[PDB]
Symmetry: C2
Subunit: 93 residues, 2 copies
């Protein structure tokens, strides 16, 4: 249950750095949450986590006032039905 | 019955993709061919959610973006640039009380 490791795992995309003032506010607000609140936050976002990674992005770098979560699919530009079919089967672990 | 066509319509397309891109049409053709258990297994991989009843997938939303020759997925947090601790704490409470 190491929450420091969960923080260190975090990655930052456009608009943010680890040193950005809003990111430093988020992590202190997150660490002040009780354990049950932390879990409910991870449920809102998605245990044991210690290997989950969360990626931060500024709202203006997408297409506004509240926090939202997005499940992104990174899909390589496949040109065949057969390779696409095979790729889905591999994602189905 | 599961509302897979609505789930397809909820999709958004980001960096270098559109609903008419030929690879997207290849994806959905392949997606609508899996069994329900494979659709659910595929869903579990893209989110990790256990709530894949009919009402869950009907409101589910997937964002497509182009990249790595493997299919990968990420959870990204869209965080407004709040200025005060009091504002940040309030936004967390709104997020987990909904």
């Amino acid at each position: 249950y190491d929450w420091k490791q969960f923080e260190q795992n975090s990655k930052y995309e456009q608009g943010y750095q680890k040193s950005h003032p809003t990111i430093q506010l988020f992590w202190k607000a997150f660490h002040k949450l009780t354990l049950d609140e932390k879990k409910k936050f991870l449920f809102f976002l998605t245990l044991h986590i210690q290997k989950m990674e969360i990626v931060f992005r500024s709202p203006e770098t997408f297409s506004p006032t509240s926090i939202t979560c997005h499940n992104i699919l990174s899909l390589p530009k496949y040109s065949t039905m057969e390779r696409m079919e095979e790729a889905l089967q591999v994602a189905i672990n």
